[PDB]
Every structure is written in C-alpha cells, then in structure tokens.
Structure 1
Amino acid sequence: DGTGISLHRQLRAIQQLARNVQAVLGAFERGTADQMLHVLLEKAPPLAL
C-alpha cells in the first residue's frame, strides 16, 4: 500500500526466508558429516576381535 507498515512486513518475510535458507544450507553441510560416520561403522569390526 506504499506505507511503512508494508515495507516492514515485506522485509520481515525475507528476514525469515534468509534465516530459513541459511538453515538448509548448513543442513547438508551438517548432514554430509552425519553421513560420514555411518558407512565407517557399517565396516570396522571392534578392537577386541
């Protein structure tokens, strides 16, 4: 509506969206590292035997 109420409202959604998209960008950065351990434990029988 060309008012300052609108631009605050417009900017809030982007300040969520950027905060949202930074989460999933860090997610595959985390999730790769999560997956890094799983195939290493599908192998590697324990030390004792």
Structure 2
Amino acid sequence: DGTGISLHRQLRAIQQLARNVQAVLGAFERGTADQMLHVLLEKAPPLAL
C-alpha cells in the first residue's frame, strides 16, 4: 500500500525468507556430518571381532 505498515509487512517476510534460507543451507553443513556416520558404520566392524 505504500503506507507506514505495508512497508513494514514487506520486511517481516524478508526476515523469514532470510532465516529460512540460512537454516537449509546450513542443513547440508549438518547433513554432511550425518552422511559420515551412516557410511562409516557400513564399514568399521566392532573392536571385539
């Protein structure tokens, strides 16, 4: 609307898109570590054997 609130409601949808996109790009930085253990436990037989 160009009024004082409809300038602001734009900014609230920007911060969500920013902090939605900051999480999922960081998720592959976390999904990398989760991809370690489920193929390192394809190998690595136990120490007792």
TM-score for the superposition, normalised by structure 2: 0.93
Relative contact order higher in (CA < 8 Å, ≥ 6 apart):
2
Identity of aligned residues (%): 100
Shift of 1:7: 1.1
Q: Deviations over 1:15-48 (max 9, x none)?
A: 1000100010110000011101111000111001
Structure 2 unaligned segments of length 5 or more: list them.
none
Instruction: State the Cα RMSD in Å.
Output: 0.6
Greater helix proportion? 1
Structure 1 unaligned segments of length 5 or more: list them.
none
